[model samples]
Target: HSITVTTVASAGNIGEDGILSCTFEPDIKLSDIVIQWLKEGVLGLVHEFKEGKDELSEQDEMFRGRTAVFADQVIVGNASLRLKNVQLTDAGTYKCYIITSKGKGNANLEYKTGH
Candidate 1:
């Protein structure tokens, strides 16, 4: 049970891209897993990282085309998520959850103001 660290952005502005790393446990299988980036208390998902692709689901209409998965490192159990062209509305608590064949491992993302 590892705790997710909070993130701080240098610039405090909207439309800026930022990266929030989720340091997951090693030796974990990323295949057959479901990862989601969601804004706390929000009614929809920010992005979905699963099925070997960063798919923008119907629940992620607002964040479509602006979200990506760390596919390069997912195989190594690094499920850190990144956002492009972030908006003021994007400033909030984010939940990164993973449900793999082994079990469930989760993380949270807290963003700071940036330019």
Candidate 2:
């Protein structure tokens, strides 16, 4: 089996929104996939979408009310993450792991934020 996973870094200021762009193999049903976004060395998940819903009950305290994924676009493999109010400590590596209908795939990306 084969799968597609990709990510790209983003550059922005500490006050602006940042995106950890991730794209995986698209699927027809939302229930047929899981999109997990995480900070490389952070304590908790940055974002997670599963079973056709946004599950934030288990995400990190640092990301509370500050992260989201495109639920409607996930059907076409758009698993990118929207990080709001970018923090200075947010700069670093992030990972995107997706379990799509075709199979599983993952990618890594860096988030750069500053003055």
Candidate 3:
């Protein structure tokens, strides 16, 4: 009997990549799930995954070609995010919003970059 969504905090270095881990417990598959990755504040629409693929046309340009997930892990309730080419501007909080057949959930992403 665990929660629908489990959001975890992650850290990464600048000029590198970061992982924002989001998990939906209970070992459910997400073939038709909706995953939304958002920046904590005004920075919205970092990335979006739905219908088994990423909707790039609607994604924020700043995050284009810089975010991805382990496609194979989606079936196991792993909605983790991999942010690439980290920059000083990339240091902040993020949210991993998920919508599965069972329920909806989210996770937090706290990242730090170089000075």
Put down candidate 2 lDDT per residue, 1-115, tens digits, no spaces.
Answer: 2688998767779988977899987888889999988888788899999998899888998899999998889998899888898989888888899997778989888888999
- Per-model CA lDDT versus the true structure: 0.65, 0.88, 0.75
Q: Give the candidate number with the greatest lDDT.
A: 2
Q: What range of 10 consecutive residues in model 1 has the weakest lDDT sum?
A: 3-12
Candidate 1 local lDDT, 1-115, one digit each (tens)? 3333233332335766867666554435555766676778877787777777776655566676777777878766666666787677777777777666656667676765555
User: Model 2: residues >4 Å from true position, as ranges?
Assistant: none
Of candidates 3 and 2, the better by lDDT? 2
- Best by TM-score, which number? 2
Residue-level lDDT of model 3, residues 34-101, one tens digit each, is: 77888866344887878788876677777888989877787777888898978888888887788777
Candidate 3 at 96: error in angstroms? 0.8
Clashes in candidate 3: how many? 1
Clash list (residue pairs), candidate 1: 11-114, 11-115, 12-114, 12-115, 13-114, 13-115
Better of 2 and 3 by TM-score: 2
lDDT winner between 1 and 2, please give it: 2
Q: Sort all candidates by lDDT, best to worst.
A: 2, 3, 1
